[PDB]
Design a protein around this ligand. Structure first.
Ligand SMILES: Nc1ncnc2c1ncn2[C@H]1C[C@H](O)[C@@H](COP(=O)(O)O)O1
Ligand SMILES: Nc1ncnc2c1ncn2[C@H]1C[C@H](O)[C@@H](COP(=O)(O)O)O1
Ligand SMILES: [Mg+2]
Ligand SMILES: [Mg+2]
Ligand SMILES: [Mg+2]
Ligand SMILES: [Mg+2]
Ligand code: NA
Ligand code: NA
Ligand code: NA
Ligand code: NA
Lengths: 219, 219
């Protein structure tokens, strides 16, 4: 895989609520930039790679946010609308396609809890459009599966897998900007920079086509 | 003006060298998000608005970086190429157009020293393409002109205008990530959040069409 695209979404609620995306962040890193990272105990927080492409967009949903979602993300439908944000629409799809076309192929999306949340929700949003999906040629992986595989390989002898728990266990500092799409992508990147060659090997061996991801719910 | 688009570029050198862009960052903020900001002396560093759209892209140039440019930005042509970055091309123009089409109109670009560097350089890059410019319906302002107008209005009775100097004079802390496109956009945003209604009034009254900007050099 040439490019890893760290992905995170905010949305109006949990899966039971048939949620709609309110924020999306993609951070594209060439594999070389990750291989080149690198410390101590606790190690200092790694510096992000220098060469990165980033896209972060706020998106007006078609339904209200649940209280918990609004309160942890700091977003609401009414605030997004008063600030002129547009819906998840065909122009957004064109934007995503052009952004992906700038990345060396093949590309793999990497999201924390992606299999149960981000990937099926993104597929739901894309299925509502008239434009072919810009993600149909991409791959994806759930970073939690990679971390758990690393744990089993490093301690076969034998915990929160929240993003913040993992980061704090690694670096003994709390993360910043939790439950913002960009903040959570940056926290995930910092976690993956801890042992980057093992994220890469997991991705190279266990990535799957994004076209296999089923929508979270029907439209 | 509905949307302010904070803009900064990195490139291969100073204007005499006929430079090419190596990094571009746009940060779009609705005027409401800035009006809603707000402290002390020195005031604490303002929190950025919650609702923002961001695009940051690294770009392979057609010529080598000068030593000073490479050393302050941390970019080089060879590093950008080995990480698969593409040139400034028509797909990038499509990406910029789709990003701008998500913003409420009219939009005004805001860049620090934009009139003498960022705006004419961006116009040079866009002039090389076969696609009509995505910026031809936008406006622009140089943030330095706005700050100097604020100084004259606040002390008619009577210094570095470097981005870092201004930030440090305001907040008594050094900025972070200097000479990265995104870091410098974020520093500029923090400066503008000091007295946001006066950036806005300057923009509302003195913005000019980006189509008036002449290329930095001929192609
Ligand atoms: N505790 C709780 N209540 C309601 N909705 C929730 C909660 N945790 C997550 N979410 C929803 C809304 C978030 O935008 C989205 C992504 O979680 P993220 O962790 O930000 O990536 O999942
Ligand atoms: N001192 C020096 N030597 C050579 N080239 C320079 C120098 N200062 C700026 N530049 C060039 C290269 C930077 O990418 C660009 C933008 O400056 P920025 O301040 O990052 O926005 O201008
Ligand atoms: Mg998440
Ligand atoms: Mg999140
Ligand atoms: Mg600059
Ligand atoms: Mg800069
Ligand atoms: Na919910
Ligand atoms: Na259903
Ligand atoms: Na130069
Ligand atoms: Na010329």
């Amino acid at each position: 895989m040439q490019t890893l695209i760290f992905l995170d979404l905010e949305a109006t609620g949990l899966p039971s609520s048939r949620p709609e995306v309110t924020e999306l962040c993609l951070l594209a890193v060439h594999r070389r930039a990750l291989e080149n990272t690198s410390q101590g105990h606790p190690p200092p927080v790694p510096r992000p790679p220098r060469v990165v492409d980033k896209l972060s967009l706020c998106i007006a949903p078609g339904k209200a946010c649940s209280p918990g979602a609004s309160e942890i993300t700091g977003l609401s439908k009414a605030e997004l609308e008063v600030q002129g944000r547009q819906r998840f629409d065909d122009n957004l799809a064109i934007l995503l396609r052009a952004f992906l076309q700038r990345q060396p192929q093949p590309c793999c999306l990497v999201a924390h809890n992606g299999d149960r949340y981000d990937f099926p929700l993104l597929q739901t949003e894309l299925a509502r459009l008239s434009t072919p999906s810009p993600l149909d040629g991409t791959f994806c992986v759930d970073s939690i599966a990679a971390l758990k595989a690393l744990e089993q390989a490093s301690s076969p002898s034998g915990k929160s897998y929240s993003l913040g728990s993992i980061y704090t266990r690694l670096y003994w500092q709390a993360p910043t900007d939790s439950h913002t799409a960009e903040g959570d992508v940056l926290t995930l990147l910092s976690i993956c920079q801890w042992k980057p060659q093992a994220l890469l090997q997991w991705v190279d061996e266990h990535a799957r086509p994004f076209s296999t991801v089923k929508p979270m719910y029907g439209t």
